[PDB]
Amino acid sequence: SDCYTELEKAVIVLVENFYKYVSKYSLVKNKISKSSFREMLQKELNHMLSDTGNRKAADKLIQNLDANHDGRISFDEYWTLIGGITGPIAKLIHEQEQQSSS
Amino acid sequence: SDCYTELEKAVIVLVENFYKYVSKYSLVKNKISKSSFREMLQKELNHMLSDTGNRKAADKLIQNLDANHDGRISFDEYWTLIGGITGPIAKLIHEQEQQSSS
Ligand SMILES: [Ca+2]
Ligand SMILES: [Ca+2]
Ligand SMILES: [Ca+2]
Ligand SMILES: [Ca+2]
């Protein structure tokens, strides 16, 4: 434990959910599905986003990614998915931290 | 800065660093440079990468990204940069976290 940064832990928190989902949430020799991918991001980002309206922002990304017929989510293929969410609302994010308030 | 999940906070920890670097570290009307980008990733990932040898993994990304001669680093452009780091060593990451340990 004991030495890793919170940035290290944050890159890790994005890999926790990757391995969680790729593995256990059906099958580890490989099942996933871009349906439950849209729910998983709604468990974990339950407060990041302002509405059903804001959902379409992630739904456009979720479309533009694994409409690819590989049956794989890859490490950075999972990242650009939510890195593309983290731009329009990322203005409010900075604001929260620079004011430290929430 | 509270009520949010640690996944929400992790997506935020990557945006703390985005605004830290793009803005404050030199100039907000636009300075950046892939020199201090290689250093910034070495402040915050002081342990994720296993050596100078492993550095070439991130150096390849740091090179290949702003081969886009925009003169900017952008929200998800900052993500694929370190999302490409978060794969070969992401095997060891999972291992740490599945043991809850180190
Ligand atoms: Ca699975
Ligand atoms: Ca895929
Ligand atoms: Ca700057
Ligand atoms: Ca650029």
Side-chain angles (χ1 to χ4, degrees):
Chain A
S1 149
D2 320 309
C3 65
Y4 270 25
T5 72
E6 84 181 62
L7 179 280
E8 290 171 327
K9 291 298 296 166
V11 170
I12 295 168
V13 166
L14 266 299
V15 166
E16 183 288 317
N17 234 286
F18 180 97
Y19 276 81
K20 182 155 68 205
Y21 184 66
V22 170
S23 191
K24 205 85 81 173
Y25 289 82
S26 188
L27 237 176
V28 62
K29 282 287 292 180
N30 186 355
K31 295 294 172 182
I32 52 70
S33 281
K34 68 102 55 56
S35 46
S36 301
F37 201 169
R38 207 272 283 266
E39 165 203 19
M40 161 264 165
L41 289 184
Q42 279 211 258
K43 282 143 147 70
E44 305 294 358
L45 301 180
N46 189 73
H47 323 107
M48 190 66 112
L49 67 92
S50 48
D51 180 42
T52 312
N54 215 146
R55 198 73 203 71
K56 271 78 83 176
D59 300 314
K60 180 263 145 180
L61 293 167
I62 286 161
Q63 185 181 104
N64 201 153
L65 273 304
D66 290 277
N68 69 76
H69 209 113
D70 63 359
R72 287 70 148 176
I73 334 302
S74 322
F75 301 114
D76 196 35
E77 189 186 14
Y78 222 115
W79 243 43
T80 184
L81 200 306
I82 180 157
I85 305 174
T86 309
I89 60 77
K91 255 274 71 192
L92 191 280
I93 292 176
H94 164 262
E95 246 84 292
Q96 314 199 280
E97 299 300 62
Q98 87 110 114
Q99 299 173 107
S100 292
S101 294
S102 281
Chain B
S1 180
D2 184 31
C3 93
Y4 278 11
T5 68
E6 86 182 72
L7 179 280
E8 288 170 329
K9 292 295 295 178
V11 172
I12 295 168
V13 166
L14 264 302
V15 170
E16 181 282 338
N17 247 275
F18 185 84
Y19 281 75
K20 183 153 69 196
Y21 177 89
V22 174
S23 180
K24 205 82 82 167
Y25 285 98
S26 186
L27 239 176
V28 63
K29 288 289 295 181
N30 182 17
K31 297 294 163 187
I32 53 69
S33 278
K34 69 164 63 77
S35 44
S36 272
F37 203 166
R38 206 271 283 278
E39 167 203 16
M40 160 266 163
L41 288 182
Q42 280 202 260
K43 281 142 146 70
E44 318 299 63
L45 303 177
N46 190 73
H47 322 106
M48 189 77 97
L49 68 96
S50 51
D51 177 42
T52 314
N54 212 147
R55 196 71 204 70
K56 269 77 81 173
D59 295 314
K60 180 262 149 184
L61 292 163
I62 291 160
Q63 188 181 115
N64 195 168
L65 252 302
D66 292 277
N68 76 82
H69 206 148
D70 59 356
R72 290 77 137 170
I73 336 299
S74 322
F75 294 122
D76 195 43
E77 189 188 3
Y78 227 106
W79 257 36
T80 183
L81 194 320
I82 177 158
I85 303 175
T86 312
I89 58 72
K91 253 274 72 190
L92 191 281
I93 292 176
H94 164 262
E95 245 84 292
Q96 317 196 279
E97 294 292 276
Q98 85 114 114
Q99 295 177 105
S100 209
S101 285
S102 201

